[PDB]
Amino acid sequence: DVVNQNAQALNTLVKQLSSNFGAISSVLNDILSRLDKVEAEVQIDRLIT
Amino acid sequence: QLQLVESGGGLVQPGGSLRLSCAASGFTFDSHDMAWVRQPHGKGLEYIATITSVGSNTYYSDSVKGRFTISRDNAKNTLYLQMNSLKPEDTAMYYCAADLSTADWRANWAKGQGTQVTVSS
Amino acid sequence: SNCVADYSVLYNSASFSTFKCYGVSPTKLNDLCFTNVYADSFVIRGDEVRQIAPGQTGKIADYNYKLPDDFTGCVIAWNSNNLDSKVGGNYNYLYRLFRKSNLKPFERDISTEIYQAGSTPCNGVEGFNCYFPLQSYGFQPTNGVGYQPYRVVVLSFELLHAPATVCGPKKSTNLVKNKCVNFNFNGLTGTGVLTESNKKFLPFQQFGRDIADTTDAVRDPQTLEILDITPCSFGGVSVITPGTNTSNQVAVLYQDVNCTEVNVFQTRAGCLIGA
Amino acid sequence: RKSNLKPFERDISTEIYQAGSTPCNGVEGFNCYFPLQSYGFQPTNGVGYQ
Amino acid sequence: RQIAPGQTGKIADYNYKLPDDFTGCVIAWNSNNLDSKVGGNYNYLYRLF
Amino acid sequence: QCVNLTTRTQLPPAYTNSFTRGVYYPDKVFRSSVLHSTQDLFLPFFSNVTWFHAIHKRFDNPVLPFNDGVYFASTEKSNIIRGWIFGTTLDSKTQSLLIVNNATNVVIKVCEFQFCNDPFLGVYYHKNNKSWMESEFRVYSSANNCTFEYVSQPFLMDLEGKQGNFKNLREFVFKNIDGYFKIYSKHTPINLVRDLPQGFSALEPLVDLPIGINITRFQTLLALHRSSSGWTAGAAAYYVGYLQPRTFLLKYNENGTITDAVDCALDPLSETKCTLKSFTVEKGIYQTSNFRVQPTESIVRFPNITNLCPFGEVFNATRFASVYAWNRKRI
Ligand SMILES: *[C@@H]1O[C@H](CO)[C@@H](O)[C@H](O)[C@H]1NC(C)=O
Ligand SMILES: *[C@@H]1O[C@H](CO)[C@@H](O)[C@H](O)[C@H]1NC(C)=O
Ligand SMILES: *[C@@H]1O[C@H](CO)[C@@H](O)[C@H](O)[C@H]1NC(C)=O
Ligand SMILES: *[C@@H]1O[C@H](CO)[C@@H](O)[C@H](O)[C@H]1NC(C)=O
Ligand SMILES: *[C@@H]1O[C@H](CO)[C@@H](O)[C@H](O)[C@H]1NC(C)=O
């Protein structure tokens, strides 16, 4: 139960990286290579939050 | 060659009257649709007067509607425009354009040379 | 499809009244790549360019031309008054005034059925409560600017779905394997180590993704082989020190890396420089 | 304008706007300003001024 | 009357331009006695176009 | 040819059970040894699919609706199913996929067809010197506004259909989201394991078309073979299943193919498998979702007022006001 609970707590943390969080994509570099910096600030701020 | 030589320009007071001419040759005159074009200083192109092929319809831009007078010449084939009740903002190079009238969807306005008219006092 | 698009010469020309891009920025079009690019040409009224956006309503956006809410493209519109308007109004351009409901997006409607206004079935004629849905445009060059004909191209492109067919003018470089590089594989930017992979892609696929949904393996579009993107930059730095009141000699533990930087000894916690 | 304007409030006061130092007390003349200028409803103006 | 942000004209295209977030004041006064010469003050050279 | 069938008979719509068939690759991303959870229009497991078979004099080719997208299968040995008329009212107002696979090339024509009522191809003269030749080309005659045409590369021409046992099979998925035919396809001649489609095989995309039409009906084009005056319907069968917005869980294998899948909303055991994201569920008690009673209908209750508001008197007044003193009209 200790081993499984630490492993599930890590896998949840990793799988939170594939989440949009309101932004366009979970991929940071796609936002970094579609939009100007004035709007990339908005989308990246949602992902950072 | 189609030739559109313009004449009858100059200076005029606010409220005055003018008349333009457009020496039109090189084409059958009722085959081409005739219109008057102005270009203000600091602005682009602008249509102020529009008449059809047989001259049965006289059309006016809303800023010059009820004050100007477009006509035509059916013997010497020359385009005219009697401009009356003039306004100070009408300071523009008044050109002379002629549509190609090809199959009713294309519009090739054969732009002339224009005579310089300034309305100042 | 199957071409190189110079989006810059389409953009820096000042002839266009409205150049509003939606999914992207109009300056990174020249570097970002696409899969399917569609152009949608049509002529509308003057102020109706407002009704071409994801989410607008009205009479153009509602009945006869809708953009989806997840739209990723650019809208081009310019004044064509000197090339569309006629002295009696250009009757060759039309629009659907009457529609039963809203229209689904990207759906052409070439129906000529008479719009039954009241209750009487029209039986194929116009008239009393029998309104013909397809009106006309009066395109006179003497009109006001809100009624002057604008020519509109909706340039929708299908982005991040597929192998790429339309890519802008960037020269490719040679391929570098087994080295920490800063790569650009057909649109996506990354930073990793490229090795030859054992993953086998079905030919409609390009991008292998891991559990965090980052691009793990790719297909090289130049020569259609399959690579394997491994990141650089392992671990952290830990500074082993005695007291400052004892010495200023230090040791540096690079955590869980192989001795790559480079006494220098491979502890099981990582490479340990200076002890 | 004389003071802070609160919303949904008409300023229909017939007190004369004294800007300088000469007390006017209800008449016009020497520096007795009058912000209530008129509308030129002539069809001669440009479309940005309609 | 063409010293304005976003507008067009001879002042607003060839030789001068204002930003849309402009604060301050545009100050001038009657200066007929201050710059005019008898034959014309052609010493004030300017670029027209 | 506006001549209908001579030996057409009305038969009832017999059903079968789609076991696990009709699972497509949802996107063009490679995965490996993961369980990916996606939500799109799917063929639900253990559902009734209509068993349309063409047999000796007893066949109907009905006009089938197109609610959200359709599955298709084809248990042939003889290449008799060709194409699909699509559309709403089945006129020249629509476009129709045709695969006239005439044993020479994969000849595909995607046009606006000149509309037919009882369409058919056919091979004939089979007692001697047959060569699988066709003449009755009446499923397509003329085509204005041909917006598309594609010719794929030729495939393994499997003319050898062994009598009896069930091997040769195809699986297609026809859906339409925002003017896009995402036609998913899979050509699986199954090995004879036990006599029936049972196991698993995933589908994959082939084409996408920028059509942009409204579709509420479709049909299926036909041919004829026998070893239609003296001819009947040839021995094959096709299946129709409808797609619904389900949610699947998909086990990609080592090499990257979907080996096993889990429908979520089939039974509560598979809902538990979707919640735990694993195909093996250990002993215990698990919480799945909420019990959610359906809403019946909409009830609008506004007070019975019928006289209008003074909008003419405000919007088209005669004596106006100014910003010095605005007229607050009360409505
Ligand atoms: C690009 O060139 C290489 C060889 O120079 C070739 O193998 C490849 O197929 C070419 N790319 C495409 C898309 O055909
Ligand atoms: C990396 O570490 C392994 C053992 O972990 C060692 O065998 C190998 O030599 C190291 N790599 C290099 C380049 O020395
Ligand atoms: C299939 O059809 C039969 C009879 O119409 C019905 O009893 C059965 O419940 C259906 N199967 C499903 C899964 O609904
Ligand atoms: C994966 O592919 C290899 C290639 O030979 C094959 O041997 C192996 O059985 C495959 N495994 C699975 C699970 O498909
Ligand atoms: C108010 O005026 C507009 C235009 O002036 C007109 O279209 C509208 O029908 C009028 N409203 C009425 C008559 O209720």
In chain A, the N- to C-terminal Cα span, in Å, equals 31
Torsion angle defined by CA atoms of residues F80, F83, F87 and F88, in that order, rounded to the nearest 10 degrees: 10
> Hunting for tokens 């300017």 — which residue is that?
E46
Mutate to test the pocket of ligand 1, among C166, C175, C222 (most ligand atoms within 8 A of CB): C222
- Residue F214 corresponds to which amino acid? N
Q: Does residue C190 sit at the F interface (CB-CB below 8 Å)?
A: no
Alpha helix ranges (H) inside chain F: 268-276, 312-315
Using CA atoms, how far apart are residues F187 and B20, in angstroms rounded to an integer? 78
Cβ distance C40 to C107 under 8 Å? no
DSSP secondary structure of C54-71: TT--SSSTTTT----TT-
Instruction: Using DSSP, state whether F36 is helix, strand or coil.
Output: strand
DSSP F58: B
Minimal CA separation from C17 to chain B, in Å: 14
Tokens at F328, concatenated: 């607050």
Phi, psi angles (nearest 5°) of residue C108:
-75, 150
C2 lines ligand 1 (CB under 6 A): no
The Cα A36–Cα A33 span in angstroms is: 8
> What is the spatial distance between Cα F75 and Cα F236, in angstroms, rounded to a whole number?
6
CA F283 to CA F270: how far, in whole Å?
14
Task: Give the pairing of strands F23-24 and F202-207.
Answer: parallel
Q: Give distance in angstroms: CA of C226 to centre of ligand 1.
A: 15
Strands F47-54 and B92-94: unpaired
Which ligand neighbours the alpha carbon of F315 most closely?
5
**H helices, E strands: number in chain D:** 0, 0
Closest listed ligand to the CA of F256: 4
Indicate which residue's Cα is closest to atom 2 of ligand 4: F255
Q: How many contacts does B have with E, using Cβ atoms within 8 A? A: 9
Evaluated on CA atoms F244, F245, F246, F248, the torsion sign reads positive
Separation CA C236–CA C110 (nearest Å): 65
Q: Among all chains, which residue has been given the structure tokens 């820096």?
A: C12
Q: How far apart are CA C76 and CA C14, in angstroms?
A: 11
Strands C215-217 and B11-12: unpaired
Residue F225: φ, ψ to 5°: -150, 145
Which neighbouring-strand residues pair with B23? B5, B78
Sign of the CA dihedral with C116 first, then C119, C120, and C126 last: negative
- Identify whether F143 is part of a domain: yes
Q: How many structural domains comprise chain F?
A: 1
Other CB atoms within a 10 A radius of the CB of residue C257 amount to 16
User: Which residues of chain D does F321 touch, with a Cβ-Cβ cutoff of 8 Å?
Assistant: none
Neighbours of F203 (CB within 10 A): 20
Cα distance between residue C82 and residue B95, in whole Å:
14
Q: Which domain holds residue F120?
A: 15-290
Cα C93 from Cα B104, distance rounded (Å): 11
Give me the domain span that covers residue B47: 3-119
Q: Which residue of C has its CA nearest to A30?
A: C188
Q: Please check whether residue F47 lies inside any domain of the structure.
A: yes
Give me the amino acid identity at B105.
Answer: W
C222 lines ligand 1 (CB under 6 A): yes
Task: Locate the chain E residue with the closest alpha carbon to B40.
Answer: E9
Q: What is the CATH number of the domain that holds B13?
A: 2.60.40.10
**CA E37 to CA E18: how far, in whole Å?**
30
CA distance F157 to F135: 20
Domain containing residue F178: CATH number: 2.60.120.960
D47 and chain B: CB distance < 8 Å anywhere? yes
Q: Is the CB of F253 under 6 A from ligand 4?
A: yes
The DSSP-derived string for F75-113 is --SS-----B-EESSSSTTS-EEEEE--SSSEEEEEE-P
Asked if B60 and C142 come within 8 Å (Cβ–Cβ), the reply is yes
Q: Are the CB atoms for B92 and B68 separated by under 8 Å?
A: no
Q: The tokens of C149 are what?
A: 């004909």
F317 within a domain of the structure (yes/no): no
E9 touches chain B (CB under 8 A): yes
Q: How was this structure determined?
A: cryo-EM
List the residue whose alpha carbon is closest to atom 6 of ligand 4. Answer: F255
d(CA B34, CA B32): 6
**Under a CB-based contact definition with an 8 Å cutoff, are residues C63 and C94 in contact?**
no
CA C248 to chain centre: 56
CA distance B73 to B80: 8
Hey, how many other C-beta atoms are within 10 angstroms of the C-beta on F59?
A: 19
| CA distances to D38, F7, F59, F319 from F229, in Å | 93, 9, 15, 85
Kindly report the protein residue whose alpha carbon is nearest to atom 11 of ligand 1: C222
φ and ψ at F271, to 5 degrees? -65, -40
- Residue F51 β-bridge partners: F239
Question: What 3-state class would DSSP assign to B69?
Answer: strand
Q: What is the spatial distance between Cα F141 and Cα B94, in angstroms, rounded to a whole number?
A: 59
CA distance F219 to F222: 10
Q: For E2-41, give the DSSP string.
A: --STT--SSIIIII----TT--S-------HHHH--SS--
Closest ligand to the CA of C178: 2
Residues 6+ apart with CB under 8 A from C177: C194, C195, C196, C227
- Token look-up 């533990």 returns C253
Resolution (A): 3.3
How far apart are alpha carbons F181 and F87 in whole angstroms?
A: 13
How far is ligand 2, taken at its centre, from the CA of residue C238, in Å? 21
Strands lying side by side in the sheet with C215-217: C215-217, C207-209, F29-30
The amino acid that residue F17 corresponds to is: N
Chains linked to B by 3 or more Cβ pairs within 8 Å: C, D, E
CA of C255: how far to CAs of C232, C240, C243, C269, F97, in Å? 14, 12, 22, 6, 61
| CA distances for E35 relative to C207, E32, F140, angstroms | 72, 6, 87
CB half-sphere exposure, C66, CA atoms < 13 A: 19
**F254 CA: nearest ligand 4 atom:** 13
- Helix, strand, coil content of chain B in percent (nearest 5): 5, 45, 50
Instruction: Name residue, tokens 């300071």.
Output: B91
Cα F70 to ligand 1 centre (Å): 38
Q: Is B24 exposed, middle or buried (0-12, 13-18, 19+ CB in 10 A)?
A: buried
Can you read off the two tokens belonging to residue E27? 């100050």
The 10 Å Cβ neighbour count of residue F124 is 15
Report the run of H or E that residue A10 belongs to, with start and end. helix A2-15
Ligand 5 centroid, distance to B51 Cα (angstroms): 31
3-state DSSP: chain A helix, strand, coil percent, rounded to 5?
A: 70, 0, 30
Do the Cβ atoms of D10 and F322 come within 8 Å?
A: no
- Identify the closest residue of chain E to B43 by CA–CA distance: E9
For residue F250, count other CB atoms closer than 10 A to its CB: 19
Count, in order, helices (H) and strands (E) of chain B.
0, 11
User: H-helix or E-strand containing B19?
Assistant: strand B17-25
Q: How many CB atoms lie within 10 A of CB F252?
A: 19
Of the candidates C68, C127, C70, the one whose C-alpha atom is nearest the C-alpha of residue C102 is C68
In a domain? residue F164: yes
Chain A residue numbers with beta carbons less than 8 Å from the beta carbon of C215 are 27
How many folded domains does chain B comprise? 1
Q: Quick check: is F189 in a domain?
A: yes
Here the tokens at position C242 are: 């005695």
Strands (E), chain F: 15-18, 23-24, 29-30, 35-42, 47-54, 64-65, 70-74, 86-87, 96-100, 106-111, 148-152, 170-174, 183-187, 202-207, 217-218, 236-240, 244-252, 258-263
| Number of C-beta neighbours around residue C79 at 10 A | 18
Contacts of B28 (CB under 8 A, 6+ apart): none
Rounded CA-CA distance A6/C105 in Å is 47
Contacts of B87 in chain D (CB under 8 A): 44
